[PDB]
């Protein structure tokens, strides 16, 4: 049971306490004496239960294990290879929508460096397309089928965590030791992501010019944000410097294109307790340890995962 409060800050009433200064007991090395220690958590990690008393969001879904701080989550290039008697054929066509015959095929033993980047809404540090931007879809007419967009020129993105966190090293047991988030050194600021609006301008123009090749030429194409649901789907879920960001993409997909110098900043939230991929069974949940210092990362936006609405015979757009 966590006895939590707001963090030490005086701001206007239009600022919900994202961070909570929590206090609780803990078992020390010995299984006798407890431990009145405090930590700092994000609001997404905790949930009230009926002085505000909370719990962790996952206590009622699954067990939990912390990710060791020694290991890292850095996407590295993986080349996939096949055994003897087999080979990997690589289409060498510049314009190829993935399905059908490939005029210029070559063969290879191991593919190129494919970084396993985990994101949801925007593909990052990917492979750029050649010449014209690429659209790929299993069935364009079916509004239930995703539309994967691969970019020709990369869009520069900059995500930062402006909070010089502190790592508290609690001793929970004779071997284990937990890494809580100590006090913040500096200002109470929010994580955000920047997108140069010029490059994004031209990129959106170049994708709509390719869309018009499939939906009639003199038509209007509108962009709206996600519909709703989980945070993992409604935000550009990803990991950067170890913290798991969840950014609002409502400022990127609110446009409308007819037949014919600043950065767009995005409010990015952070979550430490994530349970993707079901949790390896029905039990395990991972706590992303707190990271000391301000994290800044520059990435490429190299693709999108779009979905179209089911208007049927609704409009020309």
């Amino acid at each position: 049971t966590l006895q939590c409060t707001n963090v030490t800050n005086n701001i206007t009433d239009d600022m919900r306490g994202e961070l909570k200064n929590c206090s609780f007991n803990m078992t020390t090395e010995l299984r006798d004496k407890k431990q009145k220690v405090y930590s700092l958590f994000y609001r997404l990690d905790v949930v009230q239960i009926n002085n505000k008393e909370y719990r962790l969001i996952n206590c009622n879904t699954s067990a939990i294990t912390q990710a060791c701080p020694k290991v890292s989550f850095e996407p590295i290039p993986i080349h996939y290879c096949a055994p003897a008697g087999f080979a990997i054929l690589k289409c060498k066509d510049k314009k190829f929508n993935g399905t059908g015959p490939c005029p210029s095929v070559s063969t290879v033993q191991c593919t190129h460096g494919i970084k396993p980047v985990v994101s949801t809404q925007l593909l990052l540090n990917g492979s750029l397309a050649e010449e014209e931007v690429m659209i790929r879809s299993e069935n364009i007419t079916n509004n239930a089928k995703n539309i994967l967009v691969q970019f020709n020129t990369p869009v520069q993105i900059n995500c930062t965590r402006p909070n010089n966190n502190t790592r508290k090293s609690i001793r929970i047991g004779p071997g284990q030791a937990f890494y809580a988030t100590g006090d913040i050194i500096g200002d109470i600021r929010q994580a955000h992501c920047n997108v140069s609006k010029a490059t994004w301008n031209e990129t959106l123009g170049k994708v709509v010019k390719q869309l018009r090749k499939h939906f009639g030429n003199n038509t209007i194409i509108r962009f709206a944000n996600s519909s709703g649901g989980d945070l993992e789907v409604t935000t550009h879920s990803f990991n950067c410097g170890g913290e798991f960001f969840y950014c609002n993409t409502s400022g990127l997909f609110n446009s409308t294109w007819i037949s014919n110098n600043d950065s767009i900043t995005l409010p990015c939230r952070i979550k430490q307790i994530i349970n993707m991929w079901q949790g390896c069974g029905i039990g395990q949940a991972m706590y992303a340890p707190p990271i000391q210092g301000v994290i800044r990362c520059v990435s490429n936006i190299t693709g999108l995962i779009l979905t179209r609405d089911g208007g049927s015979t609704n409009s020309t757009t």
Partner: antibody, heavy 132, light 106 residues
Framework: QVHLQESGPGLVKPSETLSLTCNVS????????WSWIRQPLGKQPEWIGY???????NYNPSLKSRVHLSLDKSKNLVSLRLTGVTAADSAIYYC??????????????????????????WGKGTSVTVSS | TFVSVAPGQTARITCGEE??????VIWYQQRPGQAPSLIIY??????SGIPDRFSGSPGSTFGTTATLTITSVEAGDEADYYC????????????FGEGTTLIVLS
């Protein structure tokens, strides 16, 4: 030139209504912020509150439910009212102009900033002793 | 609090709580029997009429107290000194910090 003059009764009985006026000379009250600052004897000056045209005014949370400030545009002066006085209000009340500023520490758009005020041109001040 | 420094040197005055965020300390000078006068209006920015080198510690360091350096200390600067701390993490301070009296020796 900017001359500020504080003027009031000087003696007010307990649980009464103090009323003060700051005669300003050299500039209009519509174009400036006006703050009042008392200072007990041997203590640190205590900021009371600020007032400006267009209804922008704020008080002290510790003295929230007792003070009322005003500006006389016609007669070009500042006005202060303090109801329900006690022995703690005896101090030297100053009338000063106030200049505003914004310090931005974050990215602005996130409301990551705050406004800070500072009084530059003081008045000579008036004395107020609470006694029966 | 009292600070003793010889004339023609550097004096240093501490005022206010420790810093918690980005701060914009405002410094004031109270001559004996007079009204406070402004010296520094944005944590090391002097207005017109204040001589050098009257300097304050930059409002970007987190975890230190506001310090006021007064180079070439004279007998005329002997006065009380108050501070208005503007901390991004703390509500508005309606009470100036406890003043510091400067003592010019000899």
């Amino acid at each position: 030139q900017v001359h500020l003059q504080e003027s009031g009764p000087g003696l007010v009985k307990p649980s009464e209504t103090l009323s003060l006026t700051c005669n300003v000379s050299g500039t209009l009250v519509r174009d400036n912020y006006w703050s009042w600052i008392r200072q007990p004897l041997g203590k640190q000056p205590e900021w009371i509150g600020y007032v400006h045209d267009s209804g922008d005014t704020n008080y002290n949370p510790s003295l929230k439910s007792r003070v009322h400030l005003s500006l006389d545009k016609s007669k070009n002066l500042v006005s202060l009212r303090l109801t329900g006085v006690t022995a703690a209000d005896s101090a030297i009340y100053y009338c000063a102009t106030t200049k505003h500023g914004r310090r931005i520490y974050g990215v602005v758009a996130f409301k990551e900033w705050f406004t800070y005020f500072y009084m530059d041109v003081w008045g000579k001040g008036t004395s107020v002793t609470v006694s029966s | 609090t009292f600070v003793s420094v010889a004339p023609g040197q550097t004096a240093r005055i501490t005022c206010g709580e420790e810093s918690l965020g980005s701060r914009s300390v405002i410094w004031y000078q109270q001559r004996p029997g007079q009204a406070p006068s402004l010296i520094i209006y944005n944590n090391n920015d002097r207005p017109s009429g204040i001589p050098d080198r009257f300097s304050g510690s930059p409002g970007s360091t987190f975890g230190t107290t506001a310090t006021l350096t007064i180079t070439s200390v004279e007998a005329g600067d002997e006065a009380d000194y108050y501070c208005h701390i503007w901390d991004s993490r703390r509500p508005t301070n309606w009470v100036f910090g406890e003043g510091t009296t400067l003592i010019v020796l000899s």
